[PDB]
Amino acid sequence: GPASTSFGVNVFKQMATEQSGNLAASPFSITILLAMLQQGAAGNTLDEITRALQMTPEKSAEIFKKVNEEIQKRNSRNILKTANNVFLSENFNLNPQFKRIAVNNFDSDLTPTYFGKPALAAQNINSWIASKTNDKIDKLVSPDDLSGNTQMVMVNAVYFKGLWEIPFREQATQKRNFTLNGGEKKVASFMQTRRYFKAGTHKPAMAKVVVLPFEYNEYSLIVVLPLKSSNVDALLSSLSMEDVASFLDLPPKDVALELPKFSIKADINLEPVLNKMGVSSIFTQQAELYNLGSHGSLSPQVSSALHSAVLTIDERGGDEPSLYFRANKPFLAILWDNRSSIPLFMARIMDPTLEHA
Numbered sequence: 001g002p003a004s005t006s007f008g009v010n011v012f013k014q015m016a017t018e019q020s021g022n023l024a025a026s027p028f029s030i031t032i033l034l035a036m037l038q039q040g041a042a043g044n045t046l047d048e049i050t051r052a053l054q055m056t057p058e059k060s061a062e063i064f065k066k067v068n069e070e071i072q073k074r075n076s077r078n079i080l081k082t083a084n085n086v087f088l089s090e091n092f093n094l095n096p097q098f099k100r101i102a103v104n105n106f107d108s109d110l111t112p113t114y115f116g117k118p119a120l121a122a123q124n125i126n127s128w129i130a131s132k133t134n135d136k137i138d139k140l141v142s143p144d145d146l147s148g149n150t151q152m153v154m155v156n157a158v159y160f161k162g163l164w165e166i167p168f169r170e171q172a173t174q175k176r177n178f179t180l181n182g183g184e185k186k187v188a189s190f191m192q193t194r195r196y197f198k199a200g201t202h203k204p205a206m207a208k209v210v211v212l213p214f215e216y217n218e219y220s221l222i223v224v225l226p227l228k229s230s231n232v233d234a235l236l237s238s239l240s241m242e243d244v245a246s247f248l249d250l251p252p253k254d255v256a257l258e259l260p261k262f263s264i265k266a267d268i269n270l271e272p273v274l275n276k277m278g279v280s281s282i283f284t285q286q287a288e289l290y291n292l293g294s295h296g297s298l299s300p301q302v303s304s305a306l307h308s309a310v311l312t313i314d315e316r317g318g319d320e321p322s323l324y325f326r327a328n329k330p331f332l333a334i335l336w337d338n339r340s341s342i343p344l345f346m347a348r349i350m351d352p353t354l355e356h357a
Contacts, residue, residue, distance in 0.1 A: 022351055028158065082133075088152050121146050146304075162221075164315075166193070311335060
């Protein structure tokens with residue numbers, strides 16, 4: 001259900017309280033990072049991770065094996081590209097069992113890496129990420145973050161560009177004003193259609209909801225728009241993923257929809273937020289990750305934990321309305337996996353004209 005990615009949703013919500021502006025992240029990728037680390041953890045580190053995930057190592061491995069299986073079964077024009085890896089310094093011997101679980105359950109790997117030439121290491125990691133993400137994510141790792149003393153670089157990146165079940169008519173896309181928080185007006189490209197969508201008003205959230213399906217209903221874009229009486233950060237704080245899951249049961253309504261085109265990219269260093277979310281041990285020299293790799297009796301620790309998320313929407317697809325849904329002010333967008341019932345992407349869209357978070 002949505003409980004499996006609760007840690008990642010909590011991380012996203014924490015990050016939202018600390019900065020304004022566009023914000024995008026994958027609860028799936030952030031949870032995969034921790035659930036993968038759990039498979040090599042012991043002692044206090046294992047305890048911290050288990051408490052944060054609310055899953056045992058055996059449970060998280062089983063859940064994400066199936067989530068990944070359902071993704072890889074898809075043969076459609078929806079493009080979901082993931083890049084998960086653990087780059088372990090060659091000063092450490094990799095644990096073959098951890099590597100097996102990485103590959104067989106987490107769509108990830110354990111990869112020996114020489115960090116003594118930092119520019120070469122950074123570019124090799126970035127080139128691998130770019131090769132896995134249709135070249136959409138290509139500069140996540142900086143050479144200045146690496147040195148001969150780097151022990152472990154964790155990367156979890158995700159790119160999504162889907163095809164709507166029904167297209168937006170390109171000649172219906174129109175330039176209209178989008179009003180930012182605070183009052184600044186900016187021209188944006190609003191895609192427009194009028195169709196039946198699962199939609200409604202969530203009063204516990206003081207917000208309108210529309211569910212926009214992608215091809216073969218593999219995914220949905222769930223768009224949540226605060227009413228005049230509220231704002232997007234109040235909305236985000238109160239909105240549970242159990243609420244979001246229920247939106248897929250909303251009856252179809254005749255909706256006149258105006259939705260800005262956007263493409264949002266975020267590159268995120270997770271160490272600050274993970275230090276706030278109860279898993280600080282993984283970065284310390286007291287980290288207990290000996291079943292991930294070993295140097296004599298020494299455990300590695302996490303040197304860098306890096307996440308990138310890219311989500312792009314456009315028009316392409318395969319007598320007064322019941323609801324007007326005009327997203328010409330800040331709103332929330334959630335990319336939902338309809339088969340596994342988890343949020344793959346969360347975005348707070350403050351300004352659809354800007355591509356960065």
